[PDB]
Amino acid sequence: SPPSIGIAVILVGSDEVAIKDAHEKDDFHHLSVVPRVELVAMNETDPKSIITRICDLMSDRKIQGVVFADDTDQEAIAQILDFISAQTLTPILGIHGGSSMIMADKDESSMFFQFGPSIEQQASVMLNIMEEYDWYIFSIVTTYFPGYQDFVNKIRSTIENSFVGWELEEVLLLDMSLDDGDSKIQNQLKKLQSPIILLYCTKEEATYIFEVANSVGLTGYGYTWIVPSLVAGDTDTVPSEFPTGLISVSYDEWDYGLPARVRDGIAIITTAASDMLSEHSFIPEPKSSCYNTHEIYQSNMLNRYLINVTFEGRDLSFSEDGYQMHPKLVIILLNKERKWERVGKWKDKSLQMKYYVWPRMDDHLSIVTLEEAPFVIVESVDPLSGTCMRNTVPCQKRIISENKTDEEPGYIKKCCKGFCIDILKKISKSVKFTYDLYLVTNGKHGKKINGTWNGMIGEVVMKRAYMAVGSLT
Amino acid sequence: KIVNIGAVLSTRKHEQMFREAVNQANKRIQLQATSVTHKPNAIQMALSVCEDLISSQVYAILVSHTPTPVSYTAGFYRIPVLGLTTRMSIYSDKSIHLSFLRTVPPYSHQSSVWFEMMRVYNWNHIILLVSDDHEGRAAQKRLETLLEERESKDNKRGPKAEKVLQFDPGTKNVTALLMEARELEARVIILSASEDDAATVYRAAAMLDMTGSGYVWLVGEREISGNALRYAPDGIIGLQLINGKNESAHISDAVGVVAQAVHELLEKENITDPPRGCVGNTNIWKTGPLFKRVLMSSKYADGVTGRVEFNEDGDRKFAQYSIMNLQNRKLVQVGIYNGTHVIPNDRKIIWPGGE
Amino acid sequence: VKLQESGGGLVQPGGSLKLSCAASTFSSYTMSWVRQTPEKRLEWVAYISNGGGGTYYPDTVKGRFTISRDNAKNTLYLQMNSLKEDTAMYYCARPSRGGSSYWYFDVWGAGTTVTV
Amino acid sequence: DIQMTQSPSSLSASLGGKVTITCKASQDINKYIAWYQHKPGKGPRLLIHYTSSLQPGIPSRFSGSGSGRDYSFSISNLEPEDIATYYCLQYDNLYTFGGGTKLEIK
Amino acid sequence: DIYFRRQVELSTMYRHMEKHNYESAAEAIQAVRDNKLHAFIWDSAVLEFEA
Amino acid sequence: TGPNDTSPGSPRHTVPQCCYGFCIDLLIKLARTMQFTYEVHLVADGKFGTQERVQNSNKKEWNGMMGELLSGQADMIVAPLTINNERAQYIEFSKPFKYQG
Numbered sequence A: 001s002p003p004s005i006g007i008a009v010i011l012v013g014s015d016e017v018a019i020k021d022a023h024e025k026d027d028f029h030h031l032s033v034v035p036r037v038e039l040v041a042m043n044e045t046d047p048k049s050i051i052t053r054i055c056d057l058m059s060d061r062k063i064q065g066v067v068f069a070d071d072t073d074q075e076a077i078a079q080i081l082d083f084i085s086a087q088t089l090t091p092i093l094g095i096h097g098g099s100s101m102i103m104a105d106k107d108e109s110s111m112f113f114q115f116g117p118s119i120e121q122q123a124s125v126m127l128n129i130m131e132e133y134d135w136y137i138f139s140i141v142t143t144y145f146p147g148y149q150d151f152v153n154k155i156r157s158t159i160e161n162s163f164v165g166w167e168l169e170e171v172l173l174l175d176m177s178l179d180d181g182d183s184k185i186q187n188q189l190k191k192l193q194s195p196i197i198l199l200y201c202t203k204e205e206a207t208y209i210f211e212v213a214n215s216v217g218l219t220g221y222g223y224t225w226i227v228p229s230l231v232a233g234d235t236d237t238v239p240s241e242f243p244t245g246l247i248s249v250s251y252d253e254w255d256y257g258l259p260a261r262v263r264d265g266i267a268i269i270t271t272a273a274s275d276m277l278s279e280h281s282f283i284p285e286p287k288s289s290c291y292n293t294h295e296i297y298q299s300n301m302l303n304r305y306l307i308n309v310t311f312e313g314r315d316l317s318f319s320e321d322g323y324q325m326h327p328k329l330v331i332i333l334l335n336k337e338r339k340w341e342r343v344g345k346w347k348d349k350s351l352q353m354k355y356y357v358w359p360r361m362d363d364h365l366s367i368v369t370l371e372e373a374p375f376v377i378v379e380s381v382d383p384l385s386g387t388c389m390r391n392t393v394p395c396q397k398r399i400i401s402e403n404k405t406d407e408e409p410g411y412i413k414k415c416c417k418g419f420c421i422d423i424l425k426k427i428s429k430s431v432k433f434t435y436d437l438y439l440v441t442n443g444k445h446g447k448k449i450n451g452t453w454n455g456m457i458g459e460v461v462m463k464r465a466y467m468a469v470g471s472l473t
Numbered sequence B: 001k002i003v004n005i006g007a008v009l010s011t012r013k014h015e016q017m018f019r020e021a022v023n024q025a026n027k028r029i030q031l032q033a034t035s036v037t038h039k040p041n042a043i044q045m046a047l048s049v050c051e052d053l054i055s056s057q058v059y060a061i062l063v064s065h066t067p068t069p070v071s072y073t074a075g076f077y078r079i080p081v082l083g084l085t086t087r088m089s090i091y092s093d094k095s096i097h098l099s100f101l102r103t104v105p106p107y108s109h110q111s112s113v114w115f116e117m118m119r120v121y122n123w124n125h126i127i128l129l130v131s132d133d134h135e136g137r138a139a140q141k142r143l144e145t146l147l148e149e150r151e152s153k154d155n156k157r158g159p160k161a162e163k164v165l166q167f168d169p170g171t172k173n174v175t176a177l178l179m180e181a182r183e184l185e186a187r188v189i190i191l192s193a194s195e196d197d198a199a200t201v202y203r204a205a206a207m208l209d210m211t212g213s214g215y216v217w218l219v220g221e222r223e224i225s226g227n228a229l230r231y232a233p234d235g236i237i238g239l240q241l242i243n244g245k246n247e248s249a250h251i252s253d254a255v256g257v258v259a260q261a262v263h264e265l266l267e268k269e270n271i272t273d274p275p276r277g278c279v280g281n282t283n284i285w286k287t288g289p290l291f292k293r294v295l296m297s298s299k300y301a302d303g304v305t306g307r308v309e310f311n312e313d314g315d316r317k318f319a320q321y322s323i324m325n326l327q328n329r330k331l332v333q334v335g336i337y338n339g340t341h342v343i344p345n346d347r348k349i350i351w352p353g354g355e
Numbered sequence C: 001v002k003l004q005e006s007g008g009g010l011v012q013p014g015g016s017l018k019l020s021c022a023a024s025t026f027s028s029y030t031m032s033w034v035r036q037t038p039e040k041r042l043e044w045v046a047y048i049s050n051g052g053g054g055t056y057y058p059d060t061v062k063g064r065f066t067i068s069r070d071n072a073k074n075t076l077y078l079q080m081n082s083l084k085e086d087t088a089m090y091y092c093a094r095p096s097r098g099g100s101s102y103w104y105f106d107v108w109g110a111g112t113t114v115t116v
Numbered sequence D: 001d002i003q004m005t006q007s008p009s010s011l012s013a014s015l016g017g018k019v020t021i022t023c024k025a026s027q028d029i030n031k032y033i034a035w036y037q038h039k040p041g042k043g044p045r046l047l048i049h050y051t052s053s054l055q056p057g058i059p060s061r062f063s064g065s066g067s068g069r070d071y072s073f074s075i076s077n078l079e080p081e082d083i084a085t086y087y088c089l090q091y092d093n094l095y096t097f098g099g100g101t102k103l104e105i106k
Numbered sequence E: 001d002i003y004f005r006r007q008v009e010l011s012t013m014y015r016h017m018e019k020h021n022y023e024s025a026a027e028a029i030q031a032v033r034d035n036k037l038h039a040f041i042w043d044s045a046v047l048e049f050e051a
Numbered sequence F: 001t002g003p004n005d006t007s008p009g010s011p012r013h014t015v016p017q018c019c020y021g022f023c024i025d026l027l028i029k030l031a032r033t034m035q036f037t038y039e040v041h042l043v044a045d046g047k048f049g050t051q052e053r054v055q056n057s058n059k060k061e062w063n064g065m066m067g068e069l070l071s072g073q074a075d076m077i078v079a080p081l082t083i084n085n086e087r088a089q090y091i092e093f094s095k096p097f098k099y100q101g
Helices: A016-023 A047-060 A076-088 A121-130 A149-155 A184-191 A203-216 A258-280 A299-306 A419-430 A455-461 B012-025 B043-047 B112-121 B134-145 B175-182 B195-201 B247-266 B288-296 E002-006 E011-015 E025-032 E044-050 F022-034 F064-070
Strands: A007-012 A039-042 A065-068 A092-094 A112-114 A139-141 A196-199 A224-226 A345-347 A350-352 A367-369 A377-379 A415-417 A437-439 A447-449 A452-454 B002-008 B058-063 B081-083 B100-102 B127-130 B188-192 B237-239 B323-326 B331-333 C003-006 C017-023 C032-036 C042-044 C067-070 C075-080 C089-093 D018-024 D035-037 D062-067 D070-076 D086-088 F050-054 F059-063
Touching: A007 A016, A007 A047, A007 A258, A016 A039, A016 A258, A039 A047, A047 A076, A047 B043, A065 A258, A076 A092, A076 A112, A076 B043, A092 A258, A121 A149, A121 A224, A121 A350, A139 A149, A184 A203, A258 A299, A367 A455, A447 A455, A452 A455, B002 B012, B002 B247, B012 B247, B058 B247, B127 B134, B127 B175, B134 B188, B247 B288, C003 C089, C017 C089, D018 D062, D018 D086, D070 D086, E002 E011, F059 F064
Parallel strands: A007 A039, A007 A065, A065 A092, A092 A112, A139 A196, A196 A224, A367 A437, B002 B058, B058 B081, B081 B100, B127 B188
Antiparallel strands: A345 A350, A377 A415, A447 A452, B237 B323, B323 B331, C003 C017, C017 C075, C032 C042, C032 C089, C067 C075, D018 D070, D035 D086, D062 D070, F050 F059
């Protein structure tokens, strides 16, 4: 009872067997149309070979849609795909590599979609990462991608909302002025007097500019660098000029995997075509050739149907600009031994990470205090942000629990206000400080029992790199 | 000194005058200019880009009239591409195609020709009708950027204020916008839209009696068309370009202004070469940005169309003008202008409904 | 991988005989099988996808037939009811290139008969 | 579902003759063709793909042409180990079949 | 709401104001006399007439 | 010209109401002095005008009363409208009636 549409998959660069076996068990019956797969491998990946393969398959086969993959890092693949889709009025889903790098400002009549995060969702998850340690946004952008103007106007855009606690934006916009004597691009990096620097760029000019950052003194010890997906998304290789870890978001590191991605795209195309045959009772008749053009209005209806797809548990819908809505994201670190080791987790609002403290941070102090009346006041956190605006402290309180697991220095960072905290915030700028502020647990402040001391003096006698500010006579 | 310059042109004799202009520039270094046959259904023309790229020594492609895919194909390929039909502005713009260079101001022109006209006639209030397009947003941004006259320290009673409309490309909904614009106190209308939108408004001020004595119109180029100029009322003021129809005058100074860049670049070092015809991936000729740099700071092959100096975007910085006023049924040229020397008129302006 | 049929008979005229064809990868492979006329015509009987769905027949044997498959034992299951005027031979055929779609098999079975 | 009807009823030819059988469906097939041959009681043997693409192990004795919904398939130079019966397949809807013919030798 | 949010030193005070604001002048004036609201902030040229 | 929202929840039925008071008397004197033909219609919501980032984008429109001055729904605001730094960015005021805090 279901008829057929023609779906061609193209892989450039391996195991066409794992991709074949994964989908050919997906039974698209129980749907109104069923697919027709056709594998085709290629290795040239030049524009002329791409067009002369794509419209060759269009001329031979009644092709409904194309699922394109890649194993390169050339972004300009995607525009070529974005060129031909509006030329052919047929859907194309770029699912890996350079086809998955995000292209802003797509054409109005294009039907090209990508698996990947938007250019603004990466900034949103970059804010949600920095809301663990109350860091401060200082973004610089040297190159000029088409996805620049959305980035600053999305990163501002939350710093004026509520309960912020965020520092200023000493922003630096540069460009691709071909001028070596313009060394102020080396000289303006002294204006980044900040521990956290955002850098939205390309891979090659970042490989250039991190040598410049080492030349000025933006080393990996006192500063960090949070970097979006398009610079260091190539999980296999790394240039030697990156002692600059905590790179930001990528997708899940092995694309569920690549044949599961192929199966998901096949399900997307067939579900949209089944929805169109269920609602309007006719499918689009396929294109004649890349030569013949004259003898489509229903392609806009296909564009409306392709962006409201849902499968067994995965809302794989799309926005108007060709990216996913929900999708799974990971967080990567860089491994001074030159690997990429971190597998962080982010899902649709939420972030889950490791250790509750950042490793690699002498002027680092632990400081233990005590809650009382108006000297050190402990209050709860905001239910929308976690951090504290005017209170400006973690106060990482430990939980005493059952005696089979350790304590909780990941218990939620209760805000502390009051007199001694306002004194400490002046003494920090007075000499040079860094807090690790936490509360006592045994609740035995200022006591000496037979043999020993407890409480704040108990954590003084145990040599735990301490001060004891608070109410203490 | 045997280098190549590709071109795609409309008809056969344009290639004859092309090779003759290359022979004219041959008095400088010797040149190619193999060139080929503009074609319809241009993805086959996107096929035949590397029927021209087969020479490594091609360093510029010349294109005439459609926003052609050669800027996308031969822009991988950091090869500066010159053309004469960039009037539809959007593919020579801030969605940066790194390979384009104009030889003509766009349809969404530098609208200072309107802004400089106001100090001729002390106008202070502007109703600005603007279609919902990239052209409309470009004209809106340019005319709002043209408000730097407020930094002194002379007409500060009003530069230009009032409001803008939005004007979606629809046929019926013209009446409501003009009915709302009837209430305002401004009497000057600037309308910059498409020729089909001119054929859409087309009578709607006449049905509301917003023609004649009360108002003054300053329309763009695309009111002069066989369906639009038939139905514009009497007394409309329009603009008209100097050139863009005698393309030989463009192409002669084009091959001169690329030959000067060839002579300027040949005296330098590290002249790496483009690939030999469409061979594979990562074909990024490293002297391409250097070619864009040496071309973007060049003067003009002066002698035919006047000195043209390219900007950071690639505009001409050239005096674009000719004002056609509409008398009883025929357009007339009224004055001789410049970029700055708007030397007003030598005839009489027939203002609408009272002259 | 090879196909071997079993469950052959029409011992009740108008009865129901659940025949099968085992295989020795067949789990991603759909199924449709064949009876033969006295004019030897390879008329179709039923249709399953590889995943059990898409249960269909042609117009010859509609209305009487109960259909299933098991990709673990690599077998088909369908009871023959309206072959009661034929001395048919049935074989199993595993269409190439798998899927819930269909392509051209050379992967057919061995061929056994059903006689009334 | 769409149903097919092959025609007609005979492959009456001598040793090395020429016969042709037509795939004729009720609907447009877009050259969706296959071809099989078998003895009575032995089992089918594949012949033909989309562009009459023959099979390794199958000789060049079998050719064909046609389009849209109507196809012709010709057999010549036949050695009588191919005492068989030839069959056409369509798969527009799930699968499709018609009558087909049997081979006799005169 | 503009004057309090402009100042940073009064910011905590502003954080107490977001959960109790009203929509009209007469609403809060009537709500003060019903003991749901112990204090109110407004202009002198309305409050000196209302008292 | 009263609001459509005569009972300030759902329904929208505009009616002629009548107003009087301080600003009405001052408008009477200014209109007799400066030859004003005038109509008076009340405000949409009643929130005195403020600025916020609306439509989850990079656009800040002006809510309430002051937006009706910016959008051309009126040409004068005769109301107890304070003088601020944020409103005086592009809205001209006068010598201010009174002095209060």
